[PDB]
Each structure stands twice: as C-alpha cells, then as structure tokens.
C-alpha cells in the first residue's frame with residue numbers, strides 16, 4: 001500500500017505528514033480521557049459510580065436522574081448530584097491547549113467533543129470550532145420553548161451551590177444545563193457539521209476517547225479512506241469488535257491508523273515536540289494556568 005499518505009505508521013510519520021503540504025485540515029475527536037488529568041471524572045465510566053448512591057432520591061429507575069421529562073417533574077436529584085460532582089477547578093489540560101495551538105496554526109477544522117466540562121472553551125476554542133456532541137454546562141436555558149432565556153455557568157453554579165433549584169428570571173420555569181439528557185436528540189449541529197467536515201478532512205486526531213458511545217464513535221468511519229487517523233489514548237480503541245470501517249493499527253493491511261498509547265497530555269507533548277511546538281505549547285499552558293490560578 002505504497003500510495004498511503006503516511007510514510008510510516010508512527011507518531012513521527014504523523015508529524016511529517018502534518019507539516020507537509022498535504023495536511024491542511026485536522027478534525028479532533030475527543031472524550032473523557034482528555035479531561036481526567038484536569039480532575040474531571042469520566043462520567044460514563046462505571047467506576048465513577050454515577051448511578052451509585054441514588055437510592056436517597058427514590059427514582060423509578062436509575063437513569064431518571066438524567067431524563068428530560070423526569071427532570072421537569074423532579075429536578076432536585078439532578079441538581080443535588082451536580083453539586084456533589086461539581087469540579088473544584090476548571091483548568092484545561094495540555095491536550096486542550098494543543099488544540100488551541102492547532103487553531104492558532106490554522107490547522108483546526110473542527111473539534112468534536114463528548115465532554116460537557118467546558119474545558120475546550122476555557123482553552124480558547126470558539127463556538128465555530130466546536131461540536132459539543134453531548135452538550136455542555138457552558139450555557140443553560142430556561143426549559144420553556146417560548147422563552148429559552150440563556151444563563152451562563154456562573155449563574156448556574158451559584159444556584160447549584162446555594163441548593164436553590166434554578167428558575168428563569170423571566171418566566172419562572174426550570175433552567176437546565178445544555179447537556180443532552182435521555183429522551184433528547186443529539187444537537188442538530190452534530191449531524192450538520194459531520195456532513196460537511198468529513199468531506200474536507202486531512203487528518204483525524206482521536207484523543208481520550210474509547211469510541212464506545214454512538215453515534216459519536218461512528219465519526220471515524222466518516223473519514224475518507226485515505227485520511228490518516230492518530231489515536232492518542234491510554235488504551236487501543238476503535239478497532240472492529242470481534243463479536244458484533246474500524247481502526248486497523250496492526251494487521252499487514254494497515255496503512256493509515258496509528259496508536260500512541262499513554263496519557264493524552266504526554267502524547268500531545270510528544271507530538272508537539274516532533275512538530276517544533278513544544279516551547280510554544282509550554283508557554284501557552286503555563287500562562288493560561290497562571291491566569292486561572294490568579295483569578296481574584
């Protein structure tokens with residue numbers, strides 16, 4: 001398969017491709033693994049125990065706490081759990097700032113994220129750069145269709161910590177964080193952007209996602225057949241399930257998929273180093289972290 005775009009199936013090969021004229025547009029697909037080093041737990045991991053200690057709320061079924069209709073009937077369990085799990089700090093990771101550098105260098109077509117933690121926005125990705133496939137806590141909206149007053153995270157955090165159920169100042173309906181609940185569709189933006197972006201992509205950077213939740217995981221099968229796909233993740237992921245266009249890292253037919261196994265921050269640091277960006281990345285992270293630490 002000598003017509004392949006990567007000269008070798010390694011991080012070095014990906015970096016050479018990125019700095020070549022053939023690689024102009026990068027799509028990042030990111031999940032919980034890019035935020036665990038910021039102290040944000042993987043909410044979909046059973047080890048997080050998201051559905052443990054819910055007996056106190058007397059739910060009809062455990063998932064009711066994340067179901068839109070139940071939430072509109074009984075929002076208190078959700079907000080109590082949100083207080084319990086609310087992060088102590090919102091400091092984006094090296095990986096988030098690596099994506100900001102991609103944006104700065106003119107390479108970022110889009111970041112599709114499964115995360116709700118807002119760290120992409122704090123790191124400087126703008127609305128146009130992002131597809132928050134599972135929604136976000138970055139904004140909240142009044143639930144009444146005729147009103148839809150928007151509230152920022154600071155307002156919602158004050159309500160969560162004072163243990164006052166958030167109500168709209170205009171109409172007194174419940175205000176809900178913009179995360180996708182059970183019984184809700186993924187945002188239209190997810191499908192709209194997918195249909196356009198994957199015609200234009202030169203590289204998929206898949207970071208911190210095990211590609212286990214649909215339809216987000218299917219994004220990898222939307223890339224053109226020639227598009228290299230780099231996985232930076234603690235574990236290999238995205239390969240075909242031996243039971244049930246997956247990643248092929250290791251067969252003799254492999255031609256475009258590369259796995260770098262380790263912490264996402266370390267993989268992004270290694271890639272930045274190959275690209276000559278390590279000092280830029282360090283300076284950016286150190287300045288942004290200093291700024292966050294110095295909020296007065």
Ligand SMILES: [Zn+2]
Nearest residue numbers: 142147168171
């Ligand atoms: Zn309202």
